[PDB]
Design an enzyme around this catalytic site. Structure first.
Site, PDB file in Angstrom:
ATOM      1  N   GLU A 181     -13.973 -12.350   3.560  1.00  0.00           N
ATOM      2  CA  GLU A 181     -12.695 -12.501   4.186  1.00  0.00           C
ATOM      3  C   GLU A 181     -12.180 -11.173   5.253  1.00  0.00           C
ATOM      4  O   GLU A 181     -12.685 -10.145   4.570  1.00  0.00           O
ATOM      5  CB  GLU A 181     -11.419 -12.491   3.144  1.00  0.00           C
ATOM      6  CG  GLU A 181     -10.018 -12.022   3.842  1.00  0.00           C
ATOM      7  CD  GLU A 181      -9.084 -12.687   2.494  1.00  0.00           C
ATOM      8  OE1 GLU A 181      -9.239 -13.501   2.017  1.00  0.00           O
ATOM      9  OE2 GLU A 181      -7.923 -12.062   2.651  1.00  0.00           O
ATOM     10  N   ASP A 208       0.112 -13.618   7.204  1.00  0.00           N
ATOM     11  CA  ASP A 208       0.901 -12.987   6.394  1.00  0.00           C
ATOM     12  C   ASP A 208       2.351 -13.427   6.928  1.00  0.00           C
ATOM     13  O   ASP A 208       2.605 -13.252   8.075  1.00  0.00           O
ATOM     14  CB  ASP A 208       0.932 -11.524   6.424  1.00  0.00           C
ATOM     15  CG  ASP A 208       1.804 -10.950   5.301  1.00  0.00           C
ATOM     16  OD1 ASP A 208       2.966 -11.346   5.472  1.00  0.00           O
ATOM     17  OD2 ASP A 208       1.309 -10.198   4.587  1.00  0.00           O
ATOM     18  N   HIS A 235      -1.831 -14.882   3.158  1.00  0.00           N
ATOM     19  CA  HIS A 235      -1.483 -13.650   2.138  1.00  0.00           C
ATOM     20  C   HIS A 235      -0.356 -13.926   1.337  1.00  0.00           C
ATOM     21  O   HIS A 235       0.687 -14.547   1.515  1.00  0.00           O
ATOM     22  CB  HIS A 235      -0.910 -12.542   3.217  1.00  0.00           C
ATOM     23  CG  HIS A 235      -1.448 -11.178   2.964  1.00  0.00           C
ATOM     24  ND1 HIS A 235      -0.756  -9.982   2.750  1.00  0.00           N
ATOM     25  CD2 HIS A 235      -2.626 -10.801   2.182  1.00  0.00           C
ATOM     26  CE1 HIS A 235      -1.117  -9.091   2.370  1.00  0.00           C
ATOM     27  NE2 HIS A 235      -2.507  -9.323   2.015  1.00  0.00           N
ATOM     28  N   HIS A 239       0.703  -1.372  -0.014  1.00  0.00           N
ATOM     29  CA  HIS A 239       0.125   0.011   0.064  1.00  0.00           C
ATOM     30  C   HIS A 239       1.072   1.066   0.192  1.00  0.00           C
ATOM     31  O   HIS A 239       0.336   2.433   0.177  1.00  0.00           O
ATOM     32  CB  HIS A 239      -0.974  -0.101   1.248  1.00  0.00           C
ATOM     33  CG  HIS A 239      -1.527  -1.335   1.588  1.00  0.00           C
ATOM     34  ND1 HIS A 239      -1.196  -2.027   2.656  1.00  0.00           N
ATOM     35  CD2 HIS A 239      -2.283  -2.100   1.062  1.00  0.00           C
ATOM     36  CE1 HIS A 239      -1.733  -3.113   2.759  1.00  0.00           C
ATOM     37  NE2 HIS A 239      -2.443  -3.357   1.912  1.00  0.00           N
ATOM     38  N   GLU A 279      -2.666 -17.321  -2.892  1.00  0.00           N
ATOM     39  CA  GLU A 279      -3.105 -15.860  -3.372  1.00  0.00           C
ATOM     40  C   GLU A 279      -2.057 -14.984  -4.212  1.00  0.00           C
ATOM     41  O   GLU A 279      -0.792 -15.243  -3.797  1.00  0.00           O
ATOM     42  CB  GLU A 279      -3.240 -15.110  -2.228  1.00  0.00           C
ATOM     43  CG  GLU A 279      -3.747 -13.411  -2.314  1.00  0.00           C
ATOM     44  CD  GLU A 279      -4.026 -12.752  -1.230  1.00  0.00           C
ATOM     45  OE1 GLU A 279      -3.293 -12.941  -0.160  1.00  0.00           O
ATOM     46  OE2 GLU A 279      -4.894 -11.642  -1.426  1.00  0.00           O
ATOM     47  N   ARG A 306      -7.021   5.259   1.762  1.00  0.00           N
ATOM     48  CA  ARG A 306      -6.414   4.508   2.812  1.00  0.00           C
ATOM     49  C   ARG A 306      -5.029   5.403   3.342  1.00  0.00           C
ATOM     50  O   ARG A 306      -4.830   5.210   4.346  1.00  0.00           O
ATOM     51  CB  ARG A 306      -6.032   3.126   2.760  1.00  0.00           C
ATOM     52  CG  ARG A 306      -7.251   2.237   2.514  1.00  0.00           C
ATOM     53  CD  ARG A 306      -7.030   0.717   2.808  1.00  0.00           C
ATOM     54  NE  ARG A 306      -6.611   0.123   1.587  1.00  0.00           N
ATOM     55  CZ  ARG A 306      -6.564  -1.163   1.381  1.00  0.00           C
ATOM     56  NH1 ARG A 306      -6.924  -1.934   2.278  1.00  0.00           N
ATOM     57  NH2 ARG A 306      -5.807  -1.750   0.168  1.00  0.00           N
ATOM     58  N   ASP A 322     -12.935  -9.569   0.077  1.00  0.00           N
ATOM     59  CA  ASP A 322     -11.918  -8.846   1.177  1.00  0.00           C
ATOM     60  C   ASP A 322     -12.475  -7.467   1.939  1.00  0.00           C
ATOM     61  O   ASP A 322     -12.610  -6.510   1.209  1.00  0.00           O
ATOM     62  CB  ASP A 322     -10.406  -8.891   0.697  1.00  0.00           C
ATOM     63  CG  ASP A 322      -9.558  -8.408   1.829  1.00  0.00           C
ATOM     64  OD1 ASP A 322      -9.615  -7.666   2.571  1.00  0.00           O
ATOM     65  OD2 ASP A 322      -8.622  -9.198   1.849  1.00  0.00           O
ATOM     66  N   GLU A 351      -4.983 -12.295   8.469  1.00  0.00           N
ATOM     67  CA  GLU A 351      -3.859 -11.585   8.150  1.00  0.00           C
ATOM     68  C   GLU A 351      -3.216 -10.660   9.002  1.00  0.00           C
ATOM     69  O   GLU A 351      -1.772 -10.657   9.073  1.00  0.00           O
ATOM     70  CB  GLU A 351      -4.498 -10.814   6.876  1.00  0.00           C
ATOM     71  CG  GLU A 351      -3.575  -9.803   6.060  1.00  0.00           C
ATOM     72  CD  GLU A 351      -4.217  -8.800   5.298  1.00  0.00           C
ATOM     73  OE1 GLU A 351      -5.154  -8.782   5.144  1.00  0.00           O
ATOM     74  OE2 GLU A 351      -3.221  -7.811   4.661  1.00  0.00           O
TER      75      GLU A 351
END
Ligand code: NA
Ligand code: NA
Lengths: 396, 396, 396, 396
Positions: C241, C292, C319, C23, C339, C49, C215, C269
Site C-alpha cells: 500500500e 480519505d 482510509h 499523528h 480499515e 515523523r 503500508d 490516501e
C-alpha cells in the site's frame, strides 16, 4: 574557500494591498471587471472575482536572515495560512543550513509537506521560501540572480502586456496584448458574440500583425473553447490561454487537436512541480507552458520544469511575477518573450507590478527591459518600509 | 555588484597516457584484458580493445583564461581532433564573453556544430569546454562547483567500484563491485557458462548482500542479454549495464521487459544531450541512466538531463569522471551512490581516477568521500606540471 | 413539503491532541516508531515523523448551525490554516443556504478555491465542511448518514486493523493486519532483510490465511517496491500500500505490472477529487483505491470517486476515518471490508479512533461492527465538552 | 432516530395510449410522420414507425406500498412483458425491505436478472421499480426527490424543445429546437437535399443564434452521417444526435473525429448502465450523453453514470422523461439545460409530456421551470384515476 554564511532566522509576514497578490484590490480595476471564471455560471458571482474570494489570502512576505547580516526576502500570495506553514513547519529545515543548501532545502520542504501539499497553497508557500533563498544567495555573492542561473542569453527582455487595453499597450511599445475573457459558456451565444466583438474591435485598432491573445482563467468547457478558438481565427488570435480547469489534462489535449492550425493552446499558471508539467507535456496539452514562479515550486523547481520543456522543445513563458520572473527568463533559451501584467486600473500607463510593496523594481520602457537594469544583487529589490508588516506567528 | 571578468583566451592541449581517456593504457591492465565488445565477433580483435583502436584519441585539455588572471581547465577524451574543434571552431563563442555567460555559450557551441555534431566526438569537445567554464566560474567565485550547482544534498558520497576484482573492492569498503563482461554472443554457450562462472566465483567470495553488476560495453544482442540476465538471477546480479549498442532504443525497452523482475537494466554512457536521454526515458529503456559528464554535453547539459530524469523518477549514476562527476552527484537527489573506476592494473588498491593528470584529486576512503574533501574552488584540482602538454593548433 | 432549515452560521475551531489528526501524539506510540517516509533518506528525520512536522497542523473542527437549532460538526486534519479558510473564504457559500444545498455548496467551494487548491490542505478543508454538512442534514432528517447515502448493503462491517501488531489484531477478531514499513531504500539490503523478517515473524504467528499487508507511506522507489513485493510473496502478502509518492502515476502502473501475480498494489490516501482518481484508475495504477473521506473532497466527492470505481469494477477501501468512513462504506457494494486504525500506543487493545474528541463513537467488537450501532442521526457522535476549543478567526 | 417503514407490496400495471411510451400514439402525430429509422431501407416500413412495431409495449406502471400507508409509483415503457418481470422476478427483492434499502435492491435486481438482462427491456423494468422506490422514499420523507439527490444547483431549468416545429418552439421561449430526421441513407442524394432544405427552412425562420439539432434515431451509417454533418455546417447545426445504432461504438468515435469542428456528436438514449456509458466516454464517442432515466437503470444508476461523466468532464442531458428527468437534472452541475418533448401532434403548444397519465405534472413556461414548481413530495405527481390500470399478473 569563500566563507559561506548560515541561515540565522526565517520570518513570515503578512502584507495587504496590491503587490504579489495581484487580485488584492479595492477600486475600479480592469482585473476585477466581469472576468469569466468557473464561478461565472452563478450570476451573483459573475461581475466580481473578489465576491467569491480571489483576494482572501493576501501577500506572504518571507524574510531570511543570514549569519553575515544579509537578508533575502520574497513576496508571494498566501497571507496568514502560508505564514503559519513557514513559521511552524518549514523554518526547521532552513535555520542552521548554509545559504548554498538550496537543493537540500527544497526537497526537505516538499517531502515533509507531501501529506497536505502536492499542489496549491502549500506549494505557493514553498515557492516563496525558495525565492527568498535565491534572493539571499545573490545578496551574499553580490550577484544578480540571473548570474547564478547560468547567465542571461539575451541582453534585452521583450514584453507583451496583459490587460483590458491591447490598443494602448501597442502605443506603449509592447509586442502583444493579452486580454481577459469576459463571457463564459453560461452566457450562451450572446456572450460568445460579445467575446468575438471585443477581439474584432481590438484587432481593428492594432492592425493585422500585433499579437492578440485571450486569457480565459479556467472558465470554459471543451466545446465552448473549441468554438471560441474557431471564431477567433478570423481575427488572427495568437493563443488561447487557460481555457479549461487545470485538472482537465484530457480536455486540453483534445482542445489543442481541435484548435485552428497555427493557433496555440497554452496553460500552466495553476500547475505545480516537475510532475504536473510532465503530465501537460506528455499528454500534448500545451504549446506553451506558463508556470508562476511563486506558485509552481520556486526557482529551483522551475529550473527542472524548464529543462523538461527544453527536452520537449516547448516554450516556457512564465506568469509575470516582476523581478522573480525577469531574472529567470533572461537565462532561458526557451523563453524568447515575457509577460508584463498591467496593474494600473485602466491599463493605460506602465506601473510597477508589485507596487507599493517593492522598491528598486524595474519596469518595461517602450515594451522592453535591458539586462543592465538587473545589475543589483539578489532580485535587486528592497521591501518598502512604508508598508505595514504583521508577523502573526513565531516559532523556536 | 561584483565585477565579472571576461574570457581572454582559450587554449587546447593534448595529453597521452592514462587520465581522462580511461583506455589510453599500457600493457597488463584489466581494462584491456579480453573485454567483450561489438568487435569480439572478430577473433583477431577479441583479446585487446586497443587493437581496434580504443586508445586512438587520448586526452583533450581545455584551458580558459579570464581577464582577472584566473584560469579554468578540464580534461576529457578527444585529443588532437577535439583540439582542432576547440581552437578553430569553438573559441570564437568564448573569447570576450563574461565568464557567467554559460547557458549562452553552450547554446552557441551546440547550434554552430550541429551540421557535424549531435553525438560523439563533437559533444566530447563541447563537454570539455563547458567543464572548463564551470571550473573557471568556481575559481572566479572562490567556491567549489557543488556550491554553484545548488549545494550538496548529502554529507558523504558512497561508491561502487568498477574493475575485475569486486572481492577486493569489498575489503576496501565499497558498496558494490561492477565487473566487465569477457565473453560475447559469438563465443556461444561456453562463453555464457564462463560469464556465469565468473559471477558465481565473485558471489561466493563476497557473500549474499554485496552488490554485483555486469558492464557489457554494448557487446550483446537482445536474446543473449536476456539469457545472460536470466542465468545471473541465481547469483542475485543487481544490474546489467550497457548490454546493447546505444542506437538500439527498441532493444533496451524489450530487454527491460524481459529482465528478471527486480533486476535493473542500465545505459547511457555513450548517449548525449537532453534529446538522447528523452528517447531513453520515454521508451522505458532503462532503470538507471549513466551519462559521462565529459561525453554527454558537460555540466550545463547534464543539469537538464538530470531534471528530465527527476521528472521520470529515474536514477542518474554518472559514469565515473573523477571530480567532474563528484561535484555534480553531491548535489542531486537522484544520484544516491556513485561510480569509482579502479584504475590500478590489477584493481587491488585505490588510485586517483585521472592519474597522473590531476593534482589534488580526492579518492574514496573506505568506499566513501566526505563533502569537506571538495572544499577547494572550481573542481578543486590543478594540472600536473610534470605532464607535458602539446598545443597542436592556434587561432586568431 | 417538509420545512427545510437554512444555515445560520459556520464556525471553525482548533483542537490539539489525538483524534482526527492521527499523528498528533506525544508519547511512545507505534505510529511514530521509525515509520519509513520520503524523509527517511535523511538519518536525522528517520526515527520520528513528528521531527519533520507530520503533527504541525492539528485538528480542524467545523461546526454548522441551522435555523432550527440543529448543529452538524466534523473533525479533520488542518488546524489553524484550515480554520482561516473556513471562516474567511468558505463560510460565504454556506450561510443563507438550505441544508439540502449540498451539491451546490461543494461546487462553489471547489471552484472558488481552485487558484490555490486542487489538492492538499484546501481540499482537506472543503472535506471537513462537507462532512459537517452531511452530519447536519442527517440531524435535520433524524436519520443516520447511511440512510441518506442509498442505505446499507450489508448488516455488518468487517475490519482489518492497521498497526504494528497484526498478531494481536488476530486475537482481537480482525480479518487482517496492515503493518507500517520501517525501512526505506536508503537503508539498502539490510533494511530490506529487516522488513522481510518482520513479515516472516508475523506470518509465523498468524498462520497462512490471516491477511497481511504493508503500508509504505510514500517512501519507496519503483525498484525497491518491486523487490520488496517479490520478496514478500513467500509470506503471502495480500497487498503493498502507498509504495510511491502520489504524483508518480507512471511508477504505480509499472509497479502493478511488476507485482507478483495475485498480489495487489493499492494507493489513494493522498489523492483528491474525481480527476485524481480517474488518473489512477485509467493509468492502471491501482487494484484498490483508498481515499480519505476527510482529505479527498468529503462525502459528496467520494460518492463520485466511488461510482468512478464502480464503472471500473475496482474496490474502494477508504482510509479509516471513524464514523465518517463507517456510514459511507456500509452503503457501497465495492467496499466489502473496512480499515480500523489502532490508536492505542502498543496496538494491543481496541480503542476509539477519535478519542478524546468524540463521544458516541462505536468501535469494532471482535473485528466487526453491526449496522444497528449506526442508528443515531447524522454521523451519530457528539463533540466531547471536555475538549478545549479555540476559535482563532471570525468573519461577517 | 426516524422509524423507517418497510415495503408491504409491489404491483405492476399496464397502461396504453400516450404517457411514458412516447410512441404509443394515434394517427396524425409528428412523432410518427416519416421519421428516419434503421427500418427505412424497407420502403414498406418507411412512413410509419408503428408499422415495424414501435408501439407494441406501452406503459409499465410500478406501484410500491410501504407499511406506513405511503405509496410510491413510476411510469416507464415496457407494458405486459415488463409487468411479468416485476411481479414474478423482481418483487421478491423488495417486499419486506426497508424503503431506504435502495442501493441493495438495485444490486439484487441487476445481478438476479443478468442472465437475460444487461440491456433493453429488463433494464427498463429495473428502472421503473427504482424510480418508484425514489418516489416512495420522497413521499415517506415528505421531500421532493431533488432534495434527496444532493439539492438543486440552479434556481430554474431551461429547455430545448423536441419536435417538428422549432420555429414555433422559439416563439414559446425555448432555447433550442431539435428536429427529427426524415430521410436516411437509402433515400440517397435527394433525401440528403431534403434533410438540408428542412434545416435551411428552419434556420431562415429562427435567425442565426437559436439552437438547431437533428435527432437521427440510430438511422444512419458513418459516411452518410459525416456528409449530413458537413452539409449542416452552413446552417450552424449545434449537434447531431443518435446518428448511428447504439452498438457501433467504433463508428461514433470516427464520426466525432469526422465532425465539423465545434459541432457536437451526442448519443446514449438506447444505452444502459455504468459500463455502457464507460464504453461511450472512454472511446470518445460523444460530447453529450443522453440516457433515459426510465431506460438506463433508474435514478440510482443514472447517479453513477452522471459521476462517470463528471470525471470525463462531459455533459449529461437526459432524454426527456418528464418529472423523472426534471428532479434529477436540477441537481447536476453537468446538466445545464434539459430536453422537453413536444407531445402535441402538431407541436404547436406545450402539453404535459406524460399526458394523460400523470396528474400535477409541471410544464415549462417560456422555456423555463422554476424550482419551486417541484416542491411536492417524491416526484410530485399522482396517477390519473381516469386512466384504467390492467393488472395482468400477481405473485405470492
Ligand atoms: Na559502463
Ligand atoms: Na433522442
Amino acid at each position: 574557500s569563500l566563507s559561506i554564511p548560515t541561515i540565522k532566522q526565517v520570518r513570515a509576514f503578512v502584507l495587504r494591498g496590491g503587490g504579489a497578490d495581484y487580485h488584492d484590490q479595492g477600486d475600479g480595476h480592469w482585473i476585477d471587471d466581469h472576468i469569466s471564471t468557473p464561478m461565472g455560471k452563478y450570476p451573483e458571482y459573475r461581475q466580481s472575482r473578489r465576491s467569491f474570494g480571489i483576494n482572501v489570502l493576501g501577500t506572504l512576505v518571507v524574510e531570511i536572515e543570514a549569519s553575515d547580516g544579509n537578508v533575502g526576502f520574497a513576496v508571494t500570495t498566501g497571507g496568514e495560512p502560508a505564514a503559519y506553514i513557514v513559521e511552524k513547519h518549514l523554518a526547521r529545515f532552513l535555520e542552521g543550513a548554509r545559504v548554498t543548501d538550496i537543493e537540500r532545502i527544497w526537497d526537505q520542504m516538499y517531502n515533509s509537506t507531501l501529506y497536505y501539499g502536492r499542489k496549491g497553497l502549500v506549494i505557493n508557500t514553498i515557492s516563496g521560501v525558495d525565492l527568498a533563498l535565491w534572493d539571499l544567495l545573490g545578496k551574499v555573492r553580490r550577484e544578480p540572480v540571473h548570474q547564478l542561473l547560468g547567465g542571461a542569453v539575451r541582453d534585452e527582455l521583450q514584453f507583451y502586456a496583459t490587460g483590458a487595453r491591447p490598443d494602448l499597450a501597442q502605443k506603449m511599445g509592447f509586442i502583444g496584448g493579452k486580454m481577459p475573457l469576459h463571457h463564459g459558456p453560461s452566457e450562451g451565444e450572446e456572450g460568445l458574440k460579445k467575446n468575438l466583438e471585443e477581439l474584432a474591435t481590438m484587432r481593428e485598432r492594432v492592425g493585422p500583425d500585433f499579437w492578440l491573445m485571450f486569457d480565459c482563467w479556467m472558465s470554459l468547457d471543451l466545446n465552448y473553447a473549441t468554438r471560441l478558438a474557431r471564431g477567433a481565427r478570423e481575427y488572427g488570435l495568437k493563443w488561447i490561454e487557460e481555457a479549461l480547469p487545470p485538472d482537465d489534462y484530457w480536455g486540453y489535449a483534445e482542445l489543442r487537436r481541435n484548435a485552428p492550425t497555427g493557433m496555440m493552446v497554452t496553460t500552466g499558471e495553476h500547475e505545480a512541480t516537475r510532475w504536473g508539467f510532465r503530465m501537460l507535456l506528455e499528454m500534448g496539452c500545451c504549446d506553451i507552458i506558463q508556470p508562476d514562479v511563486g506558485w509552481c515550486g520556486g526557482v529551483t523547481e522551475l529550473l527542472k520544469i524548464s529543462a523538461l520543456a527544453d527536452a520537449h522543445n516547448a516554450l516556457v513563458v512564465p506568469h509575470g511575477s516582476s523581478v522573480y520572473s525577469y531574472h529567470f527568463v533572461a537565462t532561458r533559451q526557451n523563453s524568447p518573450f515575457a509577460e508584463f501584467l498591467m496593474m494600473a486600473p485602466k491599463a493605460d500607463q506602465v506601473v510597477p507590478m508589485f507596487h507599493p510593496q517593492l522598491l528598486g523594481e524595474p519596469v518595461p520602457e517602450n515594451g522592453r527591459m535591458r539586462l543592465s537594469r538587473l545589475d543589483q544583487p539578489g532580485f535587486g529589490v528592497t521591501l518598502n518600509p512604508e508598508c505595514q508588516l504583521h508577523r502573526p506567528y513565531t516559532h523556536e
